[PDB]
PDB file of C-alpha atoms and ligand atoms in Angstrom:
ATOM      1  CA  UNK A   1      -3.265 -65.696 -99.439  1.00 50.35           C
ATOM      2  CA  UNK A   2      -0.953 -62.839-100.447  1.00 49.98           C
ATOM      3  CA  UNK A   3      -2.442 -59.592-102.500  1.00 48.78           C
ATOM      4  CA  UNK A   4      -0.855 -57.026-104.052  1.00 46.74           C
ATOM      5  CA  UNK A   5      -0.100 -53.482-102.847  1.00 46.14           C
ATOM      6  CA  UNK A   6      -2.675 -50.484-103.852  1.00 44.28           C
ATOM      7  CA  UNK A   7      -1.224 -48.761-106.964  1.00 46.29           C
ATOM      8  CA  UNK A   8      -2.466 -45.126-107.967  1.00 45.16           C
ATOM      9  CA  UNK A   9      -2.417 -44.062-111.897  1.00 44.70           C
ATOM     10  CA  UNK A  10      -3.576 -41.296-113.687  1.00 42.94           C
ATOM     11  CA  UNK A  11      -6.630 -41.406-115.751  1.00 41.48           C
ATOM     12  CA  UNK A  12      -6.499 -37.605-117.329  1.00 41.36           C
ATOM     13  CA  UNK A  13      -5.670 -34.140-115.404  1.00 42.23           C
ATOM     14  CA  UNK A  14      -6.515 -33.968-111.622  1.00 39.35           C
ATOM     15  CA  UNK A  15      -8.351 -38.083-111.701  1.00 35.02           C
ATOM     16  CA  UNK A  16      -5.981 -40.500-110.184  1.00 30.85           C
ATOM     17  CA  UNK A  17      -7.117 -44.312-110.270  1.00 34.64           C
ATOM     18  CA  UNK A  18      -6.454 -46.512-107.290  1.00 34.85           C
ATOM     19  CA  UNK A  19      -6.977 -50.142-107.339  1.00 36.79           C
ATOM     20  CA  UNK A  20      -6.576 -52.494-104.687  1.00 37.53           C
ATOM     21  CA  UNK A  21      -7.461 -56.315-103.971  1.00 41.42           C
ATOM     22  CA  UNK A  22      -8.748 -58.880-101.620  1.00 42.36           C
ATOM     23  CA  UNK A  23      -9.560 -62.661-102.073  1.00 40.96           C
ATOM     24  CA  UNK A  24     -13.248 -63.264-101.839  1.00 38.14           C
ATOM     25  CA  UNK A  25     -14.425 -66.776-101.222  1.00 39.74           C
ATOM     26  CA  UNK A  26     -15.649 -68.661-104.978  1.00 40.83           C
ATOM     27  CA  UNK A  27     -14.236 -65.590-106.694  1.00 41.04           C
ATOM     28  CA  UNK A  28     -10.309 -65.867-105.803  1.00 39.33           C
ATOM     29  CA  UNK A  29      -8.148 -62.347-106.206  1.00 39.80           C
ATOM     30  CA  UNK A  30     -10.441 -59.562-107.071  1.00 38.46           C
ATOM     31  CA  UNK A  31      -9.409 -55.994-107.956  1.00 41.71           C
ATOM     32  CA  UNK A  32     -11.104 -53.189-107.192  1.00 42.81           C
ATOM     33  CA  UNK A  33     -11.186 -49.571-108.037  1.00 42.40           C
ATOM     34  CA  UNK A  34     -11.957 -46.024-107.217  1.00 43.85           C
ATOM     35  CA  UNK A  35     -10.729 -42.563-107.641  1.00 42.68           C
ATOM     36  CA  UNK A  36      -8.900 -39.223-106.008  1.00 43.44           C
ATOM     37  CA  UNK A  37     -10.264 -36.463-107.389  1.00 43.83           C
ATOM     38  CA  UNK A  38      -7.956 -33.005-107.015  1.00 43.56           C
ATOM     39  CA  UNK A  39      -9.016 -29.637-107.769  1.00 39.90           C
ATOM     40  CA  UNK A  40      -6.833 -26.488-106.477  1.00 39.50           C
ATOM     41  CA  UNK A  41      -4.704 -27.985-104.193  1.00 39.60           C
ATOM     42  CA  UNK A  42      -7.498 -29.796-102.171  1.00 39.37           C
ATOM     43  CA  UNK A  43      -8.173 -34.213-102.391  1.00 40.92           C
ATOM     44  CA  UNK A  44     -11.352 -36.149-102.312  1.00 39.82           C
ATOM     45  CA  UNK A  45     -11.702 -39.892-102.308  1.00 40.69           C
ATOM     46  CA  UNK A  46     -14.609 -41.420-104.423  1.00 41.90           C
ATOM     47  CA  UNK A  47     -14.688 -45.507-102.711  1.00 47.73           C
ATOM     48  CA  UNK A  48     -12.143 -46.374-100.115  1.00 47.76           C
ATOM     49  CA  UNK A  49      -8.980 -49.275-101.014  1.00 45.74           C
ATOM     50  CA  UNK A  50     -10.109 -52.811-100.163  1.00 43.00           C
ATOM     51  CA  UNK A  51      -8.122 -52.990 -96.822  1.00 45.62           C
ATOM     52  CA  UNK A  52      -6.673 -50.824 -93.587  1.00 44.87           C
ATOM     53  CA  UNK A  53      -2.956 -51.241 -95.246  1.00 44.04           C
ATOM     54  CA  UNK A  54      -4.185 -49.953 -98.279  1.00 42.47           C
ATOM     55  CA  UNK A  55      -6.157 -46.940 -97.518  1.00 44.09           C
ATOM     56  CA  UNK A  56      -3.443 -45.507 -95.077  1.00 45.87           C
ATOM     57  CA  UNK A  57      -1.440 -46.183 -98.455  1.00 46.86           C
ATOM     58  CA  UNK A  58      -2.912 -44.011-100.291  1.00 48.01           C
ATOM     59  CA  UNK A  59      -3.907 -41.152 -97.819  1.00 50.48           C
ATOM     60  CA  UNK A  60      -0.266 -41.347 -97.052  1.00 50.44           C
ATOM     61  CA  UNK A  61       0.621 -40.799-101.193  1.00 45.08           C
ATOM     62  CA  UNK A  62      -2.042 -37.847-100.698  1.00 49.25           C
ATOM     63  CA  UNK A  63      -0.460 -36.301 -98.095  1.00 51.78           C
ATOM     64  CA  UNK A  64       3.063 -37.025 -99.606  1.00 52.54           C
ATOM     65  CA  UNK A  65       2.194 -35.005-102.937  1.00 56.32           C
ATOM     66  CA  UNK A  66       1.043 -31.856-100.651  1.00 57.88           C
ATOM     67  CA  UNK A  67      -3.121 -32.139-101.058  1.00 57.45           C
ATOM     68  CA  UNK A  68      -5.364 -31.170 -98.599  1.00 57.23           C
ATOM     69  CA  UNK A  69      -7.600 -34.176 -98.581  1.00 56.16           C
ATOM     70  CA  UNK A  70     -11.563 -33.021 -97.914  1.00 58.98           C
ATOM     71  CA  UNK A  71     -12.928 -36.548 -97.239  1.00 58.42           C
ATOM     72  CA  UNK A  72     -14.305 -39.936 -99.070  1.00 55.59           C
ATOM     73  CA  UNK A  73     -17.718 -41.100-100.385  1.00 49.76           C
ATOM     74  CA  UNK A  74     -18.823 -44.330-100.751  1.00 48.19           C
ATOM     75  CA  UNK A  75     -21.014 -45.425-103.619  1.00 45.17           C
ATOM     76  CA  UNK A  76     -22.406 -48.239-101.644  1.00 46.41           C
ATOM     77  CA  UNK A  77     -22.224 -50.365 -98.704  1.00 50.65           C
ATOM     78  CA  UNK A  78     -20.259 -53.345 -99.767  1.00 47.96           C
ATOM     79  CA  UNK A  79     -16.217 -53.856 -98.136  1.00 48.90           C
ATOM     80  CA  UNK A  80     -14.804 -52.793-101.717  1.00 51.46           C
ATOM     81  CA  UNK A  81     -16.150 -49.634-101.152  1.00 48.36           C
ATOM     82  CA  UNK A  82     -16.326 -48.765 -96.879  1.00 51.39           C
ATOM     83  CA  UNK A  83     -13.506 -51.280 -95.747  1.00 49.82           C
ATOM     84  CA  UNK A  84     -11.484 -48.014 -95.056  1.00 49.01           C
ATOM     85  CA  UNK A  85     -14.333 -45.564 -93.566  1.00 46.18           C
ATOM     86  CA  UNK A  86     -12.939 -46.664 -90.111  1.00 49.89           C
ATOM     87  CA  UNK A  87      -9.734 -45.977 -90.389  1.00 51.03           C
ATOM     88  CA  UNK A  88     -10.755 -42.607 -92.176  1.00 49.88           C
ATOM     89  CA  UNK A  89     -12.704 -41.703 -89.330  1.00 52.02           C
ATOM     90  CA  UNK A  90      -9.953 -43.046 -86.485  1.00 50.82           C
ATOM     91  CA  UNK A  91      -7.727 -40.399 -88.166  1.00 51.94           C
ATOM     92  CA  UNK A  92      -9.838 -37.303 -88.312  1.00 54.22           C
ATOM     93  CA  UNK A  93     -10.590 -37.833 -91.680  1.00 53.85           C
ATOM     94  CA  UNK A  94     -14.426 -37.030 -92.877  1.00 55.12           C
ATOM     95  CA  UNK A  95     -16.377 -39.720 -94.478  1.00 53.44           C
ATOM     96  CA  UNK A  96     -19.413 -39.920 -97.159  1.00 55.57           C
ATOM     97  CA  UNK A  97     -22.225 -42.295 -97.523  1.00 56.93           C
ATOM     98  CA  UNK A  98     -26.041 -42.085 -98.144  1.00 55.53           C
ATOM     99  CA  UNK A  99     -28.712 -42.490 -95.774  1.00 52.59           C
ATOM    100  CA  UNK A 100     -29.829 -45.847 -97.257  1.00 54.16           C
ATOM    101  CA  UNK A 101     -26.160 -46.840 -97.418  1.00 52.23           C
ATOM    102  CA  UNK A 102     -25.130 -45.749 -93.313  1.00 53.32           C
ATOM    103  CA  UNK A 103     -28.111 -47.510 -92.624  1.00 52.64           C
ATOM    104  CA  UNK A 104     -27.465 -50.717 -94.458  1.00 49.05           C
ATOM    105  CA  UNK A 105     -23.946 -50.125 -92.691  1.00 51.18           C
ATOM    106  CA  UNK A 106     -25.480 -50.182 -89.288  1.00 52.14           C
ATOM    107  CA  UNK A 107     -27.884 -53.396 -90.429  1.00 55.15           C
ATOM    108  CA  UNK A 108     -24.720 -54.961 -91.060  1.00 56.34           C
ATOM    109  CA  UNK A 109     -22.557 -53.822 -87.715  1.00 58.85           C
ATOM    110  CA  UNK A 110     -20.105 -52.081 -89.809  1.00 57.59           C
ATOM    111  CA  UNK A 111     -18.632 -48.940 -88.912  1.00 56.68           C
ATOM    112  CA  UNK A 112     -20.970 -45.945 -90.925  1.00 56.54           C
ATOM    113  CA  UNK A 113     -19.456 -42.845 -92.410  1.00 61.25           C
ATOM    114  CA  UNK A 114     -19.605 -39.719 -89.872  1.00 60.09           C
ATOM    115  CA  UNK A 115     -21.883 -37.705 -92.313  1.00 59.07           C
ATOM    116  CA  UNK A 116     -24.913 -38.742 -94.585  1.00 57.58           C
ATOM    117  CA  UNK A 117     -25.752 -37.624 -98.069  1.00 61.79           C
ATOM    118  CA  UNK A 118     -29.439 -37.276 -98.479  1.00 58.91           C
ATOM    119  CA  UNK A 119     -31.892 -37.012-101.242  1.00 61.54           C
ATOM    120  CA  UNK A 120     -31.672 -38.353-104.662  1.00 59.49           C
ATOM    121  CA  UNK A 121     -29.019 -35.873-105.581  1.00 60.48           C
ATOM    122  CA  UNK A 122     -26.034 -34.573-103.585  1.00 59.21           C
ATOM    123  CA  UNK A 123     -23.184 -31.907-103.976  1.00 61.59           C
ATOM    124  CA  UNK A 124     -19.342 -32.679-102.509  1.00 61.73           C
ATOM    125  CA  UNK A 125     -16.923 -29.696-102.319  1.00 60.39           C
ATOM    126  CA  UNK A 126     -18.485 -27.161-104.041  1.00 60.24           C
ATOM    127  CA  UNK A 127     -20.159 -28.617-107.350  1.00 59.62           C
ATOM    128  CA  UNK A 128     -17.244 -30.525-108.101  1.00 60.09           C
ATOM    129  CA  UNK A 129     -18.361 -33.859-107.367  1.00 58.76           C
ATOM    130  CA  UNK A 130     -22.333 -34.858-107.908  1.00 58.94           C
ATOM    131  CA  UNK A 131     -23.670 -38.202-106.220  1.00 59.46           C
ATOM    132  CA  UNK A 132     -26.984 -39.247-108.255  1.00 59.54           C
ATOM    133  CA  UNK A 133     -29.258 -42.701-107.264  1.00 55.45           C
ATOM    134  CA  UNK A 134     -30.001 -43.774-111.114  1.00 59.03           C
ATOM    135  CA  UNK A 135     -32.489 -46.531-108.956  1.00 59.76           C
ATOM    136  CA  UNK A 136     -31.834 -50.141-107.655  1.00 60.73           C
ATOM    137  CA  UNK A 137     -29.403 -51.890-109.824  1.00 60.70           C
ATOM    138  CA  UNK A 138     -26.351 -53.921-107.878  1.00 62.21           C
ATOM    139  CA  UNK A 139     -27.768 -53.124-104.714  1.00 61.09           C
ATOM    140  CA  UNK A 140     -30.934 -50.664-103.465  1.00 60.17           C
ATOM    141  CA  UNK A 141     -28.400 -47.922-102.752  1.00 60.99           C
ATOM    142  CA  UNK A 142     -26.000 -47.442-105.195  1.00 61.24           C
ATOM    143  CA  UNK A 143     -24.792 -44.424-106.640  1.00 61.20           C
ATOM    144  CA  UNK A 144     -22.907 -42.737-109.416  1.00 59.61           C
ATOM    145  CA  UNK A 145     -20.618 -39.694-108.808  1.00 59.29           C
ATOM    146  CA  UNK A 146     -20.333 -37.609-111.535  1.00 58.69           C
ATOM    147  CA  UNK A 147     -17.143 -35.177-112.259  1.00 57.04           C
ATOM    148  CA  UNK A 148     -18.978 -32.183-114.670  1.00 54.91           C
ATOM    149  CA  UNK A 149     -14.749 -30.848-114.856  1.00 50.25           C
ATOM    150  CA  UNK A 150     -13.737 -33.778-115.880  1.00 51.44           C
ATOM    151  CA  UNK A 151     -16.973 -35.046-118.160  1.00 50.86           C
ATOM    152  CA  UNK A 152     -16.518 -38.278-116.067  1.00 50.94           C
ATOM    153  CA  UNK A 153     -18.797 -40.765-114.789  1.00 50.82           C
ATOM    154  CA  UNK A 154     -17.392 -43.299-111.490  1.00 48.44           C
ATOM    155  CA  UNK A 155     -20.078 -46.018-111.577  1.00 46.58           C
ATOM    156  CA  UNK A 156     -19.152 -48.208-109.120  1.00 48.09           C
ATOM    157  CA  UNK A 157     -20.194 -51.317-109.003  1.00 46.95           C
ATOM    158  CA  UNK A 158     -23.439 -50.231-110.732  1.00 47.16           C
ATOM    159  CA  UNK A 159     -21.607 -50.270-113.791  1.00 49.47           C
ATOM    160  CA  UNK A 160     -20.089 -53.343-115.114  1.00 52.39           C
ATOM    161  CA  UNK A 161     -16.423 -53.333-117.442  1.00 53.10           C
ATOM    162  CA  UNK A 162     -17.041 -54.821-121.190  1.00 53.59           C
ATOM    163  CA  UNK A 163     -15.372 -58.151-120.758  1.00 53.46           C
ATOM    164  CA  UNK A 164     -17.841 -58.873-118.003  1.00 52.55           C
ATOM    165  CA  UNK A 165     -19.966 -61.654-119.066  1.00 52.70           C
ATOM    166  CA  UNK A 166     -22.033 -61.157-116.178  1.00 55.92           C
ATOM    167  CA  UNK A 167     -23.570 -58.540-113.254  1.00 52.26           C
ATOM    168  CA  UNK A 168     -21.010 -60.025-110.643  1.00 50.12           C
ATOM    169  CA  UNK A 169     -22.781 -60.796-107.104  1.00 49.58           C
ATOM    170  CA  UNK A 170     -26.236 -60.527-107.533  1.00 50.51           C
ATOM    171  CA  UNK A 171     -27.276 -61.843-104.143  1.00 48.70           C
ATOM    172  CA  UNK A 172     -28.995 -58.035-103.198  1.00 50.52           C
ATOM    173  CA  UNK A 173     -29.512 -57.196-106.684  1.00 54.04           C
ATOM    174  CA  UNK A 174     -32.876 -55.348-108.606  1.00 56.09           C
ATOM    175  CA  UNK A 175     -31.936 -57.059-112.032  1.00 53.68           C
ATOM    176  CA  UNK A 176     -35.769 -55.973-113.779  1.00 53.35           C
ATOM    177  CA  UNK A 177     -35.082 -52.399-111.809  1.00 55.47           C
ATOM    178  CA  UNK A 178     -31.280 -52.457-113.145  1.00 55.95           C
ATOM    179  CA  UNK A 179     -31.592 -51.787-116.861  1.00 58.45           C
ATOM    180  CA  UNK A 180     -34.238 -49.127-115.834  1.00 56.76           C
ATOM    181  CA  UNK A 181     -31.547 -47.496-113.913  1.00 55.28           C
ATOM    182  CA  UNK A 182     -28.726 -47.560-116.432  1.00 56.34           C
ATOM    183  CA  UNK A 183     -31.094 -46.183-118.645  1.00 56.75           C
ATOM    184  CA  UNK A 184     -31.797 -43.236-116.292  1.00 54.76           C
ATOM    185  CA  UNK A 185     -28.152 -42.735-116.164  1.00 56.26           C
ATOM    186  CA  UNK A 186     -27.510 -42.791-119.763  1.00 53.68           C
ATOM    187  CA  UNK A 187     -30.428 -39.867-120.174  1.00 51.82           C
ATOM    188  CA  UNK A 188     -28.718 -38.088-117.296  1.00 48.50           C
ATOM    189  CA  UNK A 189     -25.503 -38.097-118.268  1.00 45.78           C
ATOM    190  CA  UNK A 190     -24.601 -37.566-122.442  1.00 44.16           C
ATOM    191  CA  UNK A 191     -22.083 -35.406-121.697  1.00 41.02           C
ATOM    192  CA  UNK A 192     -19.854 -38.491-119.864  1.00 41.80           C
ATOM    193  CA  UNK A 193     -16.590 -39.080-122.178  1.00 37.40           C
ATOM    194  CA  UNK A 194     -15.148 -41.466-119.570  1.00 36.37           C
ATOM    195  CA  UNK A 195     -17.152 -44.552-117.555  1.00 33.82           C
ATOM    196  CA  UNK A 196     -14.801 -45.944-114.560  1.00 33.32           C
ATOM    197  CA  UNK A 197     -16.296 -49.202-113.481  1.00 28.97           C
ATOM    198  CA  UNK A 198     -16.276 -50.846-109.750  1.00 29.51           C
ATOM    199  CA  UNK A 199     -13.970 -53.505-110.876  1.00 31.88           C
ATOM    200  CA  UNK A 200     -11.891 -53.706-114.639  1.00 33.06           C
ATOM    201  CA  UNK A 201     -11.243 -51.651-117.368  1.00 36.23           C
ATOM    202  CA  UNK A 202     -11.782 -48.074-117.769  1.00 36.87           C
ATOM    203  CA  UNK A 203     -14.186 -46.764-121.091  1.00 41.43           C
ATOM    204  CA  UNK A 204     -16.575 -44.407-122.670  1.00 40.00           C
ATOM    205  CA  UNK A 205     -20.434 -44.955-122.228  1.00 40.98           C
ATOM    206  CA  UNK A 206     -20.302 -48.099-123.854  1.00 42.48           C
ATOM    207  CA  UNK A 207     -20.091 -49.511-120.274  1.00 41.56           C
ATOM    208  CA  UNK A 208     -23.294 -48.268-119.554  1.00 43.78           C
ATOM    209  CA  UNK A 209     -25.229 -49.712-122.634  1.00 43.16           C
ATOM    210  CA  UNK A 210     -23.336 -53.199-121.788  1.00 41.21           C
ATOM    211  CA  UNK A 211     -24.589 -53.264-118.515  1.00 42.11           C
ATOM    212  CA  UNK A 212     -28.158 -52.021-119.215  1.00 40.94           C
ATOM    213  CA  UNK A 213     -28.159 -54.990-121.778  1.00 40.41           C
ATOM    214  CA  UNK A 214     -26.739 -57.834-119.232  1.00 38.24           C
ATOM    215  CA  UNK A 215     -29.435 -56.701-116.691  1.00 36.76           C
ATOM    216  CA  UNK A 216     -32.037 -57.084-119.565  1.00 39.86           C
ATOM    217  CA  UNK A 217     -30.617 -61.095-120.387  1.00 37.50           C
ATOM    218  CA  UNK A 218     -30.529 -61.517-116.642  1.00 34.46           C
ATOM    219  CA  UNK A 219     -34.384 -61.080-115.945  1.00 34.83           C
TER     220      UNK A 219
HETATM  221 CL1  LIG B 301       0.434 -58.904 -98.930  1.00 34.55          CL
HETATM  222 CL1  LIG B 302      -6.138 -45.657-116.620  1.00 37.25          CL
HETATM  223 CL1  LIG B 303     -19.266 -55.043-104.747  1.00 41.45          CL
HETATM  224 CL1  LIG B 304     -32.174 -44.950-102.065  1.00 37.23          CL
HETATM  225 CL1  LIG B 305     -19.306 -55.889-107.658  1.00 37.84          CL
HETATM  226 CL1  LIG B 306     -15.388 -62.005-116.766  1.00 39.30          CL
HETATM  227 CL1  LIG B 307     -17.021 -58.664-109.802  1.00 37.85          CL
HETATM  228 ZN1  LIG B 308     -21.330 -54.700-103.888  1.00 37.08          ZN
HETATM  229 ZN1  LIG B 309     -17.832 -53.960-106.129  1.00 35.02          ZN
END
């Protein structure tokens, strides 16, 4: 039952990768990932570490390098992405989610995040982070969070990695609703020269037009 530590690596200037693990029953070790986001001296978390240990982790690396750090998002309700919003809020620290996702939160007796994105479309810190609901896809509330500094795209678990022969866990899935989706996100977002999947490998677009075709297989 041992799991690696949470590393952090450097996509391009001011987007920092962290990926982190757990061991999910009929799946084995999983990693996950998400991002910190800097901009003039000040942090922002896009999807929290898989664990308690791992999230102090890297708020502690954070704090360490001299960032202010603004707060997290989550880009849906799943563990991979809220398993630290408790800790995050035992600290003073402010968390993210959408209305559909703190309430899917609550459904599920899991701690929510202290403040609630709503709409479609949301702004974090300024314009520098955009959250966007392309439609149902993995689950009814994901989102994307789109970086227009960085021309990157953080599709959580709404976008799938090109090895993946699959859509993952499709237990609260919209498959029929999913390629719709992906296609509303490739439309809305041209511009994207980087794709960061919820779990695997970093890419361009490409990711998008994979998953858009496994959702259209999957039907
Ligand atoms: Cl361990
Ligand atoms: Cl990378
Ligand atoms: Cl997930
Ligand atoms: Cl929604
Ligand atoms: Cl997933
Ligand atoms: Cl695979
Ligand atoms: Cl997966
Ligand atoms: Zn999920
Ligand atoms: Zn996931």
């Amino acid at each position: 039952d041992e799991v690696p530590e949470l590393r952090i690596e450097k996509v391009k200037e001011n987007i920092f990768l962290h990926t982190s693990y757990s061991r999910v029953n009929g799946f084995g070790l999983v990693s996950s990932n998400g991002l910190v986001v800097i901009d003039k001296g000040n942090a922002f978390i896009v999807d929290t570490p898989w664990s308690d240990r791992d999230t102090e982790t890297l708020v502690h690396w954070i704090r360490k390098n001299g960032y202010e750090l603004l707060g997290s998002v989550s880009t849906h309700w799943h563990e991979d992405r809220t398993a630290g919003i408790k800790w995050l809020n035992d600290q003073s620290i402010s968390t993210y989610a959408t209305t559909s996702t703190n309430h899917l939160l609550k459904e599920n007796k899991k701690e929510p995040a202290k403040y609630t994105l709503k709409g479609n479309e949301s702004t974090l810190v300024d314009g520098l982070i955009e959250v966007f609901y392309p439609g149902g896809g993995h689950t009814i509330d994901n989102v994307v969070v789109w970086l227009p500094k960085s021309k990157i795209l953080f599709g959580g678990c709404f976008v799938r990695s090109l090895d993946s022969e699959g859509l993952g866990y499709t237990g609260e899935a919209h498959i029929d609703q999913w390629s719709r989706s992906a296609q509303n996100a490739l439309s809305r977002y041209s511009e994207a020269q980087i794709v960061i999947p919820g779990h695997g490998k970093i890419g361009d677009i490409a990711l998008l037009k994979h998953t858009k075709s496994l959702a259209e297989t999957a039907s």
